[PDB]
Write a protein that binds this ligand. Structure first.
Ligand code: DGT
Ligand code: MG
Ligand code: MG
Length: 373
DNA sequence: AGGACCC
DNA sequence: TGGGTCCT
């Protein structure tokens, strides 16, 4: 165990794809999926006419006064397609990690080896790549790593073909030696295509980024922290002092993100399996009188109980979260967590008041069933 | 309970 | 600015 072959699968404008499949007439027409006053995503037809992901509806129409919009506030169908995608990938190989509703990581290492052991000391020279080779790098057929990654690209091509034939979905794939690289390379050729990264091009890929914030693992916060330290480019982070970074972000975050700056990342692909929680939200124009407005909470449970049910397992914890309007609270949420009566587990009425008591003890409102068993 | 990070 | 995961 050492050299891994990882694939990162990323779908094209996921919500938009699901909507276009539902109502065909929406195809070829610029399509935007809306949630409240946002256009969370849109089909490529729309991205051509200026529409960008997460853009105000207005700024969206005064940019494309023809953009068709559909409401994507109810995630039911997106969530269902998302699991169908994951299950299909799991068939190729069980260790699949979900990242959001449209990205999956699959460790193909075991699968690549088995396929190689099947080839003969001849046809192994006929091994070819499927899709793009990052930085148009030359393949060396005598390099065992090159061969493994190429088989990896073949598998990826099979997965994408399967996703399309069995689910009607198009998407990108990135093949590399680790999750970091696979995720970074899957987006090089953006629409419905795939790319494989050979080792000699790792630094080229990492340095192609324009800021550290672009590195998976480095968020909005850490990015700002690094700035205040004079660290802006990927090379700055690579060359920065381990000590100062270690003594200001924690030996953990520090030693880990500096590895990332070099394209190094040994995190394993984790088998996501069933969800660890179930939650539904509802933001509204500061329309909550602090009371009686819990009829909204009854709505949430309605679906949640239907979802938590279907699943099979039962939650042993419930929660409520809220927000409050005022200044520019860049981060402000509150929640009251509490166990669920063993009797009530095995229906709404009880739960309703249960959340109500949790309510009083305290713009948005969301119930979250967690601690599944 | 709250925080950070991600899609 | 509709959901999730895991760490402090
Ligand atoms: N509400 C919300 N949805 C998001 C956010 N980031 C991504 N999504 C949603 C909208 C898309 O249908 C779906 C896919 O996310 P992605 O980051 O992969 O982008 P997308 O598939 O939309 O397009 P792309 O991969 O760039 O072709 O997830 C976010 O911050 N908020
Ligand atoms: Mg994505
Ligand atoms: Mg995507």
């Amino acid at each position: 165990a050492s050299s891994r072959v990882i694939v990162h699968v990323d779908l094209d404008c996921f919500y938009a794809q699901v909507e276009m499949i539902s109502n065909p007439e929406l195809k070829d027409k610029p399509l935007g999926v809306q949630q409240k006053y946002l256009v969370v995503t849109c089909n490529y037809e729309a991205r051509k006419l200026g529409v960008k992901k997460l853009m105000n509806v207005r700024d969206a129409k005064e940019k494309c006064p023809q953009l068709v919009l559909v409401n994507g506030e109810d995630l039911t169908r997106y969530r269902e397609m998302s699991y169908k995608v994951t299950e299909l990938l799991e068939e190729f190989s069980p260790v699949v990690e979900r990242l959001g509703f449209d990205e999956n990581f699959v460790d193909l290492t075991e699968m690549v080896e088995k396929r190689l052991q099947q080839l003969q000391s001849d046809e192994l020279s006929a091994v070819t790549v499927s899709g793009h080779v990052y930085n148009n790098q030359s393949i060396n057929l005598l390099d065992v790593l090159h061969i493994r990654l190429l088989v990896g690209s073949q598998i990826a091509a099979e997965m994408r073909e399967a996703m399309y034939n069995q689910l009607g979905l198009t998407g990108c794939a990135g093949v590399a030696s680790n999750k970091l690289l696979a995720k970074l390379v899957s987006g090089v050729f953006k629409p419905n295509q795939q790319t494989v990264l050979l080792p000699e091009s790792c630094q080229h890929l990492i340095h192609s980024l324009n800021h550290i914030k672009e590195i998976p693992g480095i968020g909005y916060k850490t990015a700002k922290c690094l700035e205040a330290l004079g660290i802006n480019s990927v090379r700055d982070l690579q060359t920065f002092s381990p000590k100062i970074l270690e003594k200001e972000l924690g030996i953990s975050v520090a030693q880990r993100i500096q590895k990332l700056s070099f394209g190094e990342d040994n995190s394993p692909v984790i088998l996501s399996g069933p969800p660890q929680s179930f939650s539904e939200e509802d933001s509204f124009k500061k329309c909550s009188s602090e009371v009686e407005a819990k009829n909204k909470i009854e709505e949430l449970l309605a679906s949640l109980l239907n979802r938590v049910c279907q699943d099979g397992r039962k939650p042993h914890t419930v929660r409520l979260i809220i927000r409050r309007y005022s200044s520019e609270k860049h981060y402000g949420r509150e929640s009251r967590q509490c166990p669920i009566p063993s009797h009530v587990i095995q229906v709404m009425t009880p739960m309703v008041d249960i959340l109500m008591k949790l309510f009083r003890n305290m713009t948005l409102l969301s119930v979250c069933f967690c601690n599944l068993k």
